[PDB]
Symmetry: C3
């Protein structure tokens, strides 16, 4: 390797080594004539034109240290569905990031009973006991007798009696720490200095938690994390699980048989993902521990709030707590409805009925459905065992503190501004009347009202989704076959003494959450002037979060989360664009919907982050 510092026009413009060497010759000549003993230039002299890519320089920081502090509420024993207020103690010169520790008690569902059995299916041979319900459909024309059986069993398959004991399981909604804080408010002198609701908390969940922070984020707000599990070897090189008669076959023409398995080429095991946390239904949800961060601007250390700048008399963190019925839900436990259909094909007298003779073919089909126990609901006495505000307090030297107060003047801050408009229109133009400061960007969504409805059995999951979610089942079915000869003196091949039997049993069932988007197009208009033309919602959900923000902006998973951007660097502190209001009086967000109508009302959610100023 030889370094080449000056090769033509390209190197002259990128490295400028001829100039750099000329600057050195000039600087050493001036220092020498001016009487310096050391004529070699200073590193600053070089840095006035050229950057040094190898450089160990740094600056000393004004002496600084920090320490967290727990604080209990002024409002006594904490409960669900209440307002909890913390004082911001006088401790550090500044206070910065905050996080609230919430402790929810271990809880179980009340005792219930096995519900009544389903109604009859077939019109014939109806029998109802305490343990099963049996009906049948005859068909003497085809000779097929269909028998319907439904019963209740546990996981091991033991039949459960109607009205016997049964207990539902309990689960927390997804992201319960985000839904638990109905409203979070930082107020000084009676008025809210900044505030946000659970809609902002879930907007943050979708746009500002990259994967290198996700596992801890999920743990802070009570969302279970998946755990990877490894299986036995499913492929072993040079062998196969298939029996020999079907392996490595060739047809009569020498060609390998389509559908004939061959030996595996690699040795591999399977990975599966399991969850067993707050969102998985359990007989007893263990004590839930969450550390909910407060998503205020001053979480940034550079933006730490000077303690003397706010009186201790009226400075508070005030949190409205969601109700338990929106956080904890019952779910089916160790109780399953077994639905079995059996077909018996007879060919003799009475065929198609229960008295038909000569059974040639038998088939069984069976599914299992998790079932709710009657009268088993959540424990309403579940205690909020502990809640405490953690405040990071920063300390500085007395000299710098006095200089900082007298010379800082003000600080640039960011605040939330929320508006929710109920809609039954497929298309509408919604004046944004809570938007009233320089807006950097707006989170936008059209959440169906059913996502938060107590009648939606999937509210625990759908509440934070911004789309209409339907549930598509995926079945794992075990197929079996069996043939048996009942006459040891007659050849089975081609005889009715060569019986047939088959079975399809449900092995497991998955639920695919299928999102149907609620926004087709979005338009942003201010005083009859387009800020954003009518573009497909996919432009705001996919392209804008992809192009802007760097690691501060995450492309959202939710198909309904949209980002109306007005700045060049959405995550950074340095201002880089806004829409002032200002002539923003008539600020309109116009949408088109293929989902929203009178039968499917939705909430147009628009949350903006605005710039304001705090004078210290």
């Amino acid at each position: 390797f030889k370094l080449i510092a000056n090769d033509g026009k390209a190197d002259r413009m990128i490295m400028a080594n001829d100039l750099l060497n000329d600057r050195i010759k000039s600087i050493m000549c001036l220092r020498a004539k001016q009487g310096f003993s050391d004529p070699t230039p200073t590193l600053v002299d070089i840095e006035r034109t050229h950057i040094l890519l190898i450089n160990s320089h740094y600056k000393p920081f004004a002496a600084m240290g920090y320490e967290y502090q727990k604080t209990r509420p002024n409002t006594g024993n904490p409960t669900y569905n209440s307002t909890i207020q913390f004082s911001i103690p006088q401790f550090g010169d500044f206070f910065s990031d905050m996080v609230v520790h919430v402790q929810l008690a271990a809880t179980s569902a009340s005792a219930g009973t096995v519900p009544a059995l389903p109604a009859f299916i077939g019109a014939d041979d109806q029998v109802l006991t305490s343990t099963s319900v049996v009906s049948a459909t005859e068909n003497t024309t085809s000779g097929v007798y269909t028998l319907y059986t439904q019963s209740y069993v546990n996981q091991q398959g033991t039949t459960q009696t109607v009205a016997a004991a049964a207990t539902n399981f309990v689960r927390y909604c997804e992201y319960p720490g985000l839904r638990l804080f109905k409203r979070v408010k930082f107020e000084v002198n009676g008025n809210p200095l900044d505030e946000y609701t659970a809609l902002a908390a879930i907007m943050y969940n979708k746009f500002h938690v990259p994967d290198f922070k996700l596992t801890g984020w999920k743990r802070l707000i009570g969302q279970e994390v998946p755990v990877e599990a490894a299986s036995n070897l499913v492929n072993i090189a040079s062998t196969t699980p298939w029996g020999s008669p079907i392996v490595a076959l060739s047809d009569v023409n020498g060609t390998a048989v389509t559908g004939s398995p061959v030996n595996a080429a690699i040795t591999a095991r399977k990975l599966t993902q399991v969850v067993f946390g707050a969102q998985t239904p359990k007989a007893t949800q263990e004590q839930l521990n969450m550390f909910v961060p407060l998503l205020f601007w001053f979480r940034d250390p550079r933006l730490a709030i000077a303690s003397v700048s706010i009186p201790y008399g009226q400075r508070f963190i005030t949190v409205d707590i969601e109700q338990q019925s929106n956080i904890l839900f019952t779910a089916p436990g160790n109780l399953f409805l077994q639905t079995t259909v059996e077909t018996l094909l007879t060919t003799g007298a009475g065929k198609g009925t229960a008295t038909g003779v000569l059974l040639t073919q038998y088939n069984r089909y069976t599914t299992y459905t998790p079932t709710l126990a009657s009268g088993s609901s959540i424990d309403g006495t579940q205690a909020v065992q502990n809640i405490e505000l953690y405040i990071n307090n920063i300390f500085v030297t007395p000299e710098i503190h006095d200089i900082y107060i007298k010379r800082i003047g003000f600080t640039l801050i960011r605040v939330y501004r929320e508006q929710v408009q109920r809609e039954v229109n497929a298309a509408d133009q919604v004046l944004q009347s809570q938007l009233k400061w320089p807006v950097e960007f707006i989170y936008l969504g059209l959440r169906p009202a059913n996502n938060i409805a107590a009648g939606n059995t999937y509210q625990w999951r759908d509440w934070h989704h911004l789309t209409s979610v339907t549930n598509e089942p995926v079945y794992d079915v075990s197929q079996s076959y069996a043939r048996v000869s009942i006459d040891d003196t007659v050849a089975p091949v081609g005889s009715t003494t060569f019986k047939q039997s088959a079975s399809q049993v449900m092995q497991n069932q998955y639920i695919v959450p299928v999102e149907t988007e609620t926004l087709d197009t979005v338009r942003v208009k201010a005083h009859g002037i387009e800020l954003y033309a009518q573009y497909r919602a996919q432009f705001y959900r996919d392209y804008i979060p992809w192009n802007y923000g760097s690691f501060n902006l995450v492309t959202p998973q939710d198909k309904g989360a949209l980002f109306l951007n007005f700045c060049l660097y959405p995550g950074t502190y340095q201002p880089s664009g806004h829409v002032n209001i200002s002539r923003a009086r008539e600020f309109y967000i116009e949408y088109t919907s293929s989902f929203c109508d009178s039968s499917n009302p939705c909430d147009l959610i628009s949350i903006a982050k605005c710039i304001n100023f705090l004078l210290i």
Copy 2:
């Protein structure tokens, strides 16, 4: 209790005795110089010390942006054509660009069920319109082996040969990346910069971190996984296993290895499903893509002055791939059922179809998705819309005229690609495309078969830089059944106690196994070693891990290599390059364990070079 001045260590990191001296001095000068306030200025402190609590920012020269979409000058768009957009006159600058492509919903044409496979066995051959049956006698063992093959749909209903059948349709992986064969930024008739799908897949591998991946996939039409949860598989203190095998102990009291016990946790499984453009469907929905144009001027800092590239001579030209490389036929609801049955008789005629005393029966059943004959893609599928979206930046007139008169020039990065087809196991390939300083080079040796029409996995392998083979993984359902056919003799130890067993394919996965095509790579330029002969994992794993930070993603593709020559690939500030003298005689040397005359490969080399752009 802050400390600030504990020893030499605190003296060099915080320098608090120095800072106090500077403050005490500054207060005395200002007092001596007649200032009303002697306390220093934050700038005065920051000339030596850095302030960790600082809300300072600089005002930005007023600017705002707005997107504008335009249609091509070349009329109705089609596959296999050139589409050209003019860049309209709108803002003072134009920046990031994205192209909306809309492909009509499409399905395959009607076909037929193909002919059944040939005979497997030599005996008892029967050909039906609905099944093909053969057999293999074995009088020595008494085993009659019966082979049956037929066609079924998903529900299992038999399909008649030459009856109706329709194939499904699928898109190739990353359709938005392959759709654009070439993308041109044209000025004065000269290509100012251009790239291919090869550069697009290099970007897909190296510059899409996980916090941008979901949105990136949606922009280019790649399906996104959807996580689905199952029923509870583990329930604390119970089991799915029947009691006779649960928690057994041997005669010595030790727990039986292989005897399952109750579960200790309660868990669900998570599986992932896809159902988008790449999943075969009877009808693929209207595919909407917003394909970003990966030019350098996507950076807002590097927006192009509208005056410096005049209107009327600036164009975006896009070459569109043929339809047959984007949309593909895949098997529909038609499956080949492969069944082997073995009959173990012991009486007269054992091993033939006339065997009498049947003792054991086995059935083995696999299913293979099958293409219908004469069912192909719709060649009239229209490109329903294509529009270029351009971000337009507006600035004040005062700063505009100052910047255009003073910036002089701007650095740009341009693609420079070369593809050399190889049948040599090792070769030294002169890189003739290189004319300018090179920051880094994307490298790969892609097998020609990955883009060959004869490859039925071309829809998937086209962007892979290795040789991919397909390894089946079988989910097998095993069943057993035993029945006594004589109620007067005990079953145990009697031939009246018949046996039956079945193995049915429940599902099958395809594992894409990558075989690396590059063993070692060496970089030699102007008779100078810039990279010695190093293993391919050095360029694939080590270099992307060490350099680039969040701007350089470690590639999943095992054949993606990154030859770096700068310290910070991904930043605008230059940080190293290969100079033009060496770039004009530049060699990339490889050794391969795969490439030979039976496996031709293309050595793809795409360098990112530095050039310049004058202003007006």
Copy 3:
């Protein structure tokens, strides 16, 4: 305008600055009165700005080096020279090559003991026992045997060979000790404990796959299945699809046609951690995690000359890197139940069989006398060094004017613990502390007797194994008399089977730390907080893309700076307090029966002279 826009953009100030400068330039006689971009940038920032500054000429090239200590082996000290090449040397990575290796031939072990007390038979292929029950008429038969994957029964004492696997992250455990020697004295050094703290905290997802490939961790491969859902059809037979009861209501548990067309994805692994008959040659590029990996902090070769600079790697034993695992050998456990109703019911001679049931599991089993190859060679080991070159003019200025460089060093202490709560003095802290990795790893995680040591060795919690079963369920009915109506008859036989289709092992983590408290020279730096504060909140809040929230439930981060991972210092623990530094813990797991290691790895600030 107005007020808000005057403070964010100050455009009326900017225009007045422009008007002022253009006039003063005209007053002073400048030919071009239009302002300079610098003059604008003294107050306002230019969001569109293609300006850059030229860098002093500099290039880099890597170099490969073989060790001074002869042929490399396991369980040995390997030392490298740092050759003289560039003016500075920077990032380092070590290529390790481990030979392809297989287990020695062994045998099929002895069959298990009898389960039932009756009808006990032992052959070379199976062990059979039975439990009678004349009261219920159920005769239970137990059969255990060895098979391969295809189900072919294996004979006791016949040939059988174990597979081999590597521990997880073999590149991190192989380098038992990595140290940078300068003039005899270790300038900085770390262990595998520091390497796995980097694994948990400093590898974000955009670097994860290559990291795993660098240190020998297998990477999952996504695999797609056939279609499982097809719109407007179903896999279920007609008799159970879309049923309605007698009231017209759709039947609960009756499947309907699929609404979407979807296929499944699953992940498979088949690398160094997956057991194989032959583990092919393993190639790792293990990076050395020293501070001077940052190009800016590259070490001047003149200040640390050749001959007095070395990289020394202590290599772990093979028994901690390579392990045996079950091969193509499985124990089949089968239970059959025969309910008879006639004479001799509940015994082997009972007549009238109405119900048959079979339960069958398979457990992967080790072959006897099949162990790892102790002669497996370290086929190659080489040090890669990035060498940085500069012009002679700037090197001269830089060596005379830089003075010193701040460096960071690892300081580690391991404390064997049997107390449920303790106050542990951190006696290894010489220098200012930026942050501390904390962990309480059970001694059983690195125990030779722990069959899961290949996996648990780097975990900081107590790990237990929870099976998850895939079970195939079957049913069969047969009429054995063609003259009797089957419904309601004992001639209508019943049969059912549960067969294990697969089995997963879920690693269940039990945290070993409940609360942590930090006391230093009589000062509380951290009150007694829950472990989840240090594992979840602190890594989430701090560090940006340089601090990853750890997956390990036992990884704790004791932070004392504002920007961990960045070169510019942003907070530390003064040395006075560091000399009397205590970490007080509370544990639900550690006791006299469960020893644990309190692992504390501090990152400290140190200076380094130049020239």
